[PDB]
Amino acid sequence: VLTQSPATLSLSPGERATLSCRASQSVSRSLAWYQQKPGQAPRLLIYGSSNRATGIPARFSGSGSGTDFTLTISSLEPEDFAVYYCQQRIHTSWTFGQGTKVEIKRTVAAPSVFIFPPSDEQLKSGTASVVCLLNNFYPREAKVQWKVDNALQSGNSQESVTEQDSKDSTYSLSSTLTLSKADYEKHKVYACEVTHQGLSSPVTKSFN
Amino acid sequence: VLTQSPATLSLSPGERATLSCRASQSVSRSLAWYQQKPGQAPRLLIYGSSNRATGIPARFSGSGSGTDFTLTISSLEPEDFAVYYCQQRIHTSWTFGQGTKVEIKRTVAAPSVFIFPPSDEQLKSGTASVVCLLNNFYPREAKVQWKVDNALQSGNSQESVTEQDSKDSTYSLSSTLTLSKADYEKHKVYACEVTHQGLSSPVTKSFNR
Amino acid sequence: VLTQSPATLSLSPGERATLSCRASQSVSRSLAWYQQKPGQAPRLLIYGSSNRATGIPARFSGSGSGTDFTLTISSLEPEDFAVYYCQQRIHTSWTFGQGTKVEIKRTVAAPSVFIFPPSDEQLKSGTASVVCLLNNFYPREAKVQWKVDNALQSGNSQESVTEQDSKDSTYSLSSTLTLSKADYEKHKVYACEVTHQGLSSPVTKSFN
Amino acid sequence: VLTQSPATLSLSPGERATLSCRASQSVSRSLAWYQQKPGQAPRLLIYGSSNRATGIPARFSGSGSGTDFTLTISSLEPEDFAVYYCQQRIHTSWTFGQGTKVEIKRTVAAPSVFIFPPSDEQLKSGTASVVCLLNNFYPREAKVQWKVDNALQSGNSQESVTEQDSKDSTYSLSSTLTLSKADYEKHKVYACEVTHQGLSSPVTKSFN
Amino acid sequence: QLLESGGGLVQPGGSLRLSCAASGFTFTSYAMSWVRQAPGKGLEWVSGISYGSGDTYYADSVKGRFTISRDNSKNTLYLQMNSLRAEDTAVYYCARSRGSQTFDYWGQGTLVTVSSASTKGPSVFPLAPSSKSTSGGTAALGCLVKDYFPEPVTVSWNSGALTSGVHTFPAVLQSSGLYSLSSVVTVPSSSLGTQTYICNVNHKPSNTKVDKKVE
Amino acid sequence: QLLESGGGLVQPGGSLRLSCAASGFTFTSYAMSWVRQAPGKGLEWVSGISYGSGDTYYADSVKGRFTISRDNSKNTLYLQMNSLRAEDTAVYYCARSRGSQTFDYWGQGTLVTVSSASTKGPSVFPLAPSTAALGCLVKDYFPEPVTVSWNSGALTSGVHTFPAVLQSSGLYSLSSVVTVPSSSLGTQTYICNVNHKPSNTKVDKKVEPK
Amino acid sequence: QLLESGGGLVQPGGSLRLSCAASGFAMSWVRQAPGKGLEWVSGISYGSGDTYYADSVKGRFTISRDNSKNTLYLQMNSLRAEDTAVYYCARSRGSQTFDYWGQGTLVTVSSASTKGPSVFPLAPSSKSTSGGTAALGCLVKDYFPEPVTVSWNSGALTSGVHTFPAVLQSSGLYSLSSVVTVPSSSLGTQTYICNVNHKPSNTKVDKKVEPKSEF
Amino acid sequence: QLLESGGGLVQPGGSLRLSCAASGFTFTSYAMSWVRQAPGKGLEWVSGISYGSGDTYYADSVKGRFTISRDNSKNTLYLQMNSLRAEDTAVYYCARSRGSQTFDYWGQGTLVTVSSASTKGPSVFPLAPSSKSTSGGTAALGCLVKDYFPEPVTVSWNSGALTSGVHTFPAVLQSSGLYSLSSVVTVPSSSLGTQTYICNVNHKPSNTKVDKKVEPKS
């Protein structure tokens, strides 16, 4: 029932980090914290705030009281950059918080931008996807717009962003514009404009 | 390596069943018998052909020696009609036979025969099929011959037969003729001749698109 | 140095096969016969034409004297349809006879005939190879002719014929008409005419 | 798992060679030493650091304890100037060190430096590599840098070094810059800077 | 006693890891094995493990493709099926051995299918009683279920209410690689024009459910 | 410790049985629960069963739809999921409780999807490179479970896989791009190995610059 | 028994050292040019020395045996186009026969460079298909090394498969064809893969064959 | 004492089955391993199996891809190399263990190359001594051999006549997947304009031979 904050944390490895779990309801009890990596089941970090879970290094310590708790990691390692969740026992129900991810901090970098025109198979099938790829950028603040014969396109595209990688802490983004085969044929110039903190002016790549 | 016979055994409820398993080469050891119903795992009947398995009615008894064995069931109940299999341990391998199907004997019954023309949906989809259904017949010796404009068809049909079903008391058979839409439409008269022991003569049912 | 005959012997399974090795030179000794299956190294059949190889069924027996010998297979089985060779010892050299082949005699039947137009990638490369397939036919006397816009083609085709298969004992034939991309484009109707004993009137298949 | 020192050992023939292997991991297991010549399987020298391999000259001896060992050659012969490796064991795992080469010690010498512009055939083919050749230098500590219109290049070049030539004992080096045809034609001046112990200031050779 | 899963459909050349758990007789007290049955065929032994560690045996027909093991802590038998071909399609069964000669107990059976065909749900084409598929007081009505490559299609009538006079046929593999099934019911001809018959077709792996009106 | 399976695609209003076997801890010595995570969401507790007999608990969101039970001879936990809704789509995890306060051990996660869409495999449409980035667009496959790799795992670096999104059709679209030296174009080709498990669809596409 | 290698493609006037390891015990080499019979090339007596050569290879071929390696060697020098053949290793019996033969190593002498195949699928389409049988296949072409292994569906499809031995074109390069007859009902349900493998050029081409008829 | 083969060029994701025959030893009395050495690298242990049979071990770097086995009737060691990565390119060697700690006998080795590149013979691009790549009495002339996917390349000057002053570099791979090699020779500068130098480039597994004339093309 308790909420957590900061909504997002961004720290360098070696730095101290804390995550709060705050009152929303007047439920007084000692809560426990869990860690979830992408693609994996969560693991318990502490046998409640007072005790560490077996196998968890003494970098991790939970503390607090009543309705307000903190998870403290004295020094982060790449292995700890994960989503942390809190859990209480309310009446008889098991209840989890919303959770917050701790991201690995690095410097600002513009994406490499690539445009991939639709294949012949894609067009024969009756759909003309156009794909814009942003590679190795940081932070996850990239904004991508499509332009077709200088018209601004939105609402006809979807975006998917990868998790920041473990080797370089950067993001990749794939923006797919979905046009019907007919829409692709009606228009000639396809372009995509990328805005990001690491670039001085929007980057535009295109094919026609 | 051993083979079994009769290929099909047909017994009235209450009659004695004899099933054989015979040498093809010499593999001298006692083999075991199993039974199976469709949709079910096989069950052990006997702990070798000289014994009886736990849970099996004391009607079932294995017997034999050397390389040649039989299973005798002193009397069958309607629920003991199953496919019977043999298991022979050879060197280190466990080898299974082909099995004998045991069916319930009853009198001869001609099938009711129905012909079902293709669905409008099959034709819209570009194909066609005609189904000849044989209901409530006995034994499984029906021969279903498809004809188109009186020409005998071959290699363009499938057949499936049910188990003898107690409420029906017999078998049903489904024979399907496969046509492209074009073959269905080029021809006008579809017919099928059914030969069976209960018929005084093969019966032909037919329809024109 | 000894020569054999007939170049081709055509026998049904179950028939007795006689193969000859004719005198050419006055070389007197018991010669040996060998068997070669397609795609395989040859094997010895007999240890001279007066004995047998260990393990060979006693269906195979060589006989003769001096410079004139034969090999007799008392009854043919599918495993016997192979190329047979003779070997002598002349001075110090090992000599091998050209050999003869024993083929399966069976019911005469026409091929199924299929035509395969060039692929778009094959057209893209710049070569147009049109392929005519004769499937499952017997005997190997098929004559296959290519026609383009009803003109008879010559000098621009290749042919490959398979050996007899192990179950039906028939032959397949692949006739390829090689046109440049440009020749394929100049002409519209491609066809191939097949004259085989099993077919009555020539079979013509075609495409555009 | 254990590391070696020095990375490079340079000795005259007749001199005593000492090579070390040191703790990285707490593995209390005696190691063995091997020697490998270019193009040949590694050759054992000792039966672990306690005895000699059968057939090795009694010049070779291993010694040490715990996690820290050395190999000593009392006096080197021309055939001992190879790469030496140590081998350890961890439970059931086998492991090898990185290895140290014993080089023939010779007079320090600056390279002769030559620059070879792209060939005409090479440029017509769409590539413009440039080759900087260093001949007859010693020790193998040369550093070669490419410049285009005097701007320092990186990431677009490769280096290959010969084994020392046991006649002179000097080394040769080929540094290749790999530009595309277009990059080569856009720029006008190509140059390469060579740094070595035998020269007083980096040597730069250049062309257009 | 023996409960199993881990089968399903794989492309030729691929693999599946099949397993069976034991409950009742101690797993670790008995020798265990795998038996398979191709649709329409009799039984074939595949492989098995003698009582004790290792000592794994295989049929010649499965050598180089099938590997076995047993986990005595999990009380579970395993079969690793690699580089599979269409001839490996079968229902596989786990069985508990008796001495060295007999299979005293058997699991339910897991379908393992090896095929180039993709998962496809059925189309249903009703076989109407019309005025021509009816004779006197007896009418035949039904549905043809076709072109679904997976075999476990369950068909019932009137949502399970009609069982009386209902006959279904074993699925048959067609030349296309897909399966078809016949489902028919014999009803009084007096029901025609008053009772609509519903054929309820449920294909599990394709998430397909088709309800057809047959009159 | 928590070996779990039984997932799959269920139509709305349908049902599914999930199960998990113990693998280490005595099953009968601990309370057990199920937790589900919808894609894009946090952890929702669903149900649980106590140490001893019965005493089950359910989340309000599943009351009347879910039933939990355990078989102490089989050392297996069961969950019967009835009358399911699209909102029940989630990865279900089993977990072993500690006293009354924590979940110490977790299973692998079993995916249950509830949808009117049928099982459908992907079409694959290569994205030619014309450093260069090459890849493939994998699309119109209703089931989420999809594995994409390059050169059968021989190429592992430089690979960026973009989690699938839905189109207006209700079907998924996934993208996989690998970065390679531009100098390899025309010398090497790359293979995109696309595997959709429940549809038995395997597509190997050859990607070349163009 | 006889394990051989050491062949390959060499320019005219060049050389190759061919060899064969063998179990048991005189020894010889026999060569078969494509389309020809068996030509004895050379041989060596049991024990030490005493070699024999065919006149056709004198001055070009040398035979020897390594008795520590139990390996036979043939040094093939100053080779001509006419020396292209499969060279088989064989073991002699007494003075009359060759009882054991190796697989045969292909030795090619040619001015042509190594070139891998291009593969161009031959679709069954919808018009060349007849009744229940469709013939689909692939044309493999422009590959100078004559050997080219072709299989379907990675070896899963063996029935109805016809491989046509390679033929030289006027270009000096070879073409090969492989077709398979399949049920016509499988077109559009199943696809077929032609697996073309040419070891000498490190070329592996997997093509999908589909009924690419009307759009 | 150890002879091995089964190597060669394999596609990424593909496989090879390497093998080695033992001689002079009872095969079954000794444990064995495979060791590999990538170009430019030291020795890496890959896998091993005890004498008799079983108890195999793998390096972490090859787990899930490599399998080791032995045939005691054939006295032959085998390595099943599956799902090969580009990184698995190396010369593979067999070796016979001493007790459980040392390797006393090593085999001849076999080369395994894992690559997507097709076989390609070299192109040769001469490096002229010019008047600009000549200094005083020494002229440096040579040829750049490039884009040949197989590394095996032999270069010989003046058809074997020039055996001194010749400096051949080991080949390196390109980012394209192909190999390149530099071959140069130092000659007296007095020979320029009178002696044409010939670079004979011989690539066996491509049947390619290129003879280039190197001239002071200033």
Tab-separated table of C-alpha atoms in Angstrom, chain B residues 33-162:
chain	number	residue	atom	x	y	z
B	33	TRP	CA	1.318	-59.246	-22.574
B	34	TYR	CA	-0.207	-55.738	-22.389
B	35	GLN	CA	-3.510	-54.236	-23.552
B	36	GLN	CA	-4.433	-50.817	-24.899
B	37	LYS	CA	-7.511	-48.702	-25.538
B	38	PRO	CA	-7.377	-45.512	-27.658
B	39	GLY	CA	-6.501	-42.431	-25.709
B	40	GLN	CA	-4.954	-44.546	-22.942
B	41	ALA	CA	-1.550	-45.851	-21.917
B	42	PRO	CA	-1.139	-49.624	-22.314
B	43	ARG	CA	-1.700	-51.718	-19.232
B	44	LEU	CA	0.134	-54.809	-18.139
B	45	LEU	CA	-1.984	-57.916	-18.212
B	46	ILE	CA	0.471	-60.481	-17.156
B	47	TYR	CA	3.918	-60.545	-15.533
B	48	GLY	CA	5.266	-62.676	-18.334
B	49	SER	CA	3.521	-65.447	-20.284
B	50	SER	CA	3.171	-67.797	-17.294
B	51	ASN	CA	1.758	-65.272	-14.810
B	52	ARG	CA	-0.918	-62.570	-14.026
B	53	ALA	CA	-0.470	-58.846	-13.210
B	54	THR	CA	-1.914	-57.137	-10.163
B	55	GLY	CA	-5.303	-55.532	-10.867
B	56	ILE	CA	-6.089	-57.806	-13.798
B	57	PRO	CA	-9.226	-60.035	-13.556
B	58	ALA	CA	-8.467	-63.708	-12.965
B	59	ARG	CA	-9.679	-64.646	-16.383
B	60	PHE	CA	-6.432	-63.579	-17.952
B	61	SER	CA	-3.621	-66.155	-17.883
B	62	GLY	CA	-0.236	-66.252	-19.647
B	63	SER	CA	1.206	-69.561	-20.926
B	64	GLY	CA	4.009	-70.973	-23.107
B	65	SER	CA	7.718	-71.736	-23.314
B	66	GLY	CA	10.896	-71.060	-25.206
B	67	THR	CA	10.186	-68.743	-28.110
B	68	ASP	CA	6.422	-69.321	-28.525
B	69	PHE	CA	3.766	-67.983	-26.152
B	70	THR	CA	0.077	-67.330	-25.860
B	71	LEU	CA	-2.387	-65.384	-23.763
B	72	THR	CA	-5.658	-67.001	-22.944
B	73	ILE	CA	-8.543	-65.158	-21.460
B	74	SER	CA	-11.104	-67.669	-20.231
B	75	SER	CA	-13.996	-65.332	-20.969
B	76	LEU	CA	-14.121	-61.675	-22.079
B	77	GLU	CA	-16.316	-58.893	-20.725
B	78	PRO	CA	-17.177	-55.939	-23.102
B	79	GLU	CA	-14.447	-53.948	-21.289
B	80	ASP	CA	-11.674	-56.491	-22.120
B	81	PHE	CA	-11.828	-55.679	-25.789
B	82	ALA	CA	-8.555	-53.872	-26.460
B	83	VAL	CA	-5.451	-54.192	-28.612
B	84	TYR	CA	-3.121	-56.764	-27.124
B	85	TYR	CA	0.678	-56.405	-27.286
B	86	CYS	CA	3.746	-58.507	-26.646
B	87	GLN	CA	6.983	-57.467	-24.938
B	88	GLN	CA	10.175	-59.482	-25.419
B	89	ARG	CA	13.506	-58.631	-23.753
B	90	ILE	CA	16.255	-59.247	-26.348
B	91	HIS	CA	19.845	-58.885	-25.223
B	92	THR	CA	19.414	-55.477	-23.615
B	93	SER	CA	16.570	-54.027	-25.716
B	94	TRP	CA	12.895	-54.124	-24.907
B	95	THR	CA	11.099	-55.131	-28.074
B	96	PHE	CA	7.445	-54.704	-28.809
B	97	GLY	CA	5.306	-56.657	-31.230
B	98	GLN	CA	2.693	-55.360	-33.662
B	99	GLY	CA	-0.280	-56.351	-31.554
B	100	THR	CA	-3.645	-58.093	-32.039
B	101	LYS	CA	-6.881	-56.227	-32.098
B	102	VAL	CA	-9.680	-57.925	-30.187
B	103	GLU	CA	-13.227	-56.881	-31.106
B	104	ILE	CA	-16.684	-57.767	-29.888
B	105	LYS	CA	-18.611	-60.255	-31.980
B	106	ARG	CA	-22.223	-59.570	-32.679
B	107	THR	CA	-24.349	-60.267	-35.690
B	108	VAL	CA	-23.877	-58.753	-39.071
B	109	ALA	CA	-25.345	-55.313	-39.565
B	110	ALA	CA	-25.517	-53.397	-42.805
B	111	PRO	CA	-24.592	-49.691	-42.511
B	112	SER	CA	-26.986	-46.854	-42.846
B	113	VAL	CA	-25.405	-44.840	-45.607
B	114	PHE	CA	-25.462	-41.081	-45.927
B	115	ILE	CA	-23.772	-38.798	-48.467
B	116	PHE	CA	-22.849	-35.272	-47.549
B	117	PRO	CA	-22.163	-32.833	-50.498
B	118	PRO	CA	-19.463	-30.132	-49.930
B	119	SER	CA	-20.156	-27.090	-47.797
B	120	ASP	CA	-20.578	-23.714	-49.473
B	121	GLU	CA	-17.679	-22.573	-47.318
B	122	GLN	CA	-15.347	-25.213	-48.775
B	123	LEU	CA	-16.232	-24.102	-52.233
B	124	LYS	CA	-15.708	-20.425	-51.409
B	125	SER	CA	-12.324	-21.496	-49.996
B	126	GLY	CA	-11.417	-23.250	-53.314
B	127	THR	CA	-11.826	-26.919	-52.282
B	128	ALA	CA	-14.465	-29.556	-51.931
B	129	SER	CA	-15.103	-32.805	-50.236
B	130	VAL	CA	-17.829	-35.339	-50.148
B	131	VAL	CA	-18.369	-37.493	-47.114
B	132	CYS	CA	-19.800	-40.984	-47.143
B	133	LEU	CA	-20.916	-41.934	-43.729
B	134	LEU	CA	-21.613	-45.453	-42.693
B	135	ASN	CA	-23.476	-45.795	-39.427
B	136	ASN	CA	-24.123	-48.699	-37.077
B	137	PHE	CA	-22.489	-51.530	-39.029
B	138	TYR	CA	-20.706	-54.726	-38.161
B	139	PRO	CA	-17.929	-56.104	-38.769
B	140	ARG	CA	-15.298	-53.641	-40.052
B	141	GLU	CA	-15.244	-55.080	-43.558
B	142	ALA	CA	-17.067	-52.283	-45.316
B	143	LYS	CA	-15.518	-51.210	-48.559
B	144	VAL	CA	-16.425	-47.782	-49.717
B	145	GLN	CA	-15.970	-47.017	-53.384
B	146	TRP	CA	-16.191	-43.462	-54.630
B	147	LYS	CA	-17.360	-42.758	-58.116
B	148	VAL	CA	-17.680	-39.555	-60.092
B	149	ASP	CA	-19.981	-39.634	-63.117
B	150	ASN	CA	-19.697	-43.421	-62.660
B	151	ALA	CA	-15.901	-43.399	-62.964
B	152	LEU	CA	-14.202	-45.181	-60.112
B	153	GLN	CA	-11.946	-42.930	-58.057
B	154	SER	CA	-8.694	-43.986	-56.447
B	155	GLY	CA	-5.937	-42.355	-54.373
B	156	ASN	CA	-8.022	-39.256	-53.633
B	157	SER	CA	-9.860	-40.345	-50.523
B	158	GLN	CA	-9.357	-40.990	-46.823
B	159	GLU	CA	-10.873	-43.451	-44.391
B	160	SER	CA	-11.414	-43.448	-40.639
B	161	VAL	CA	-13.253	-45.965	-38.501
B	162	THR	CA	-14.467	-45.715	-34.915
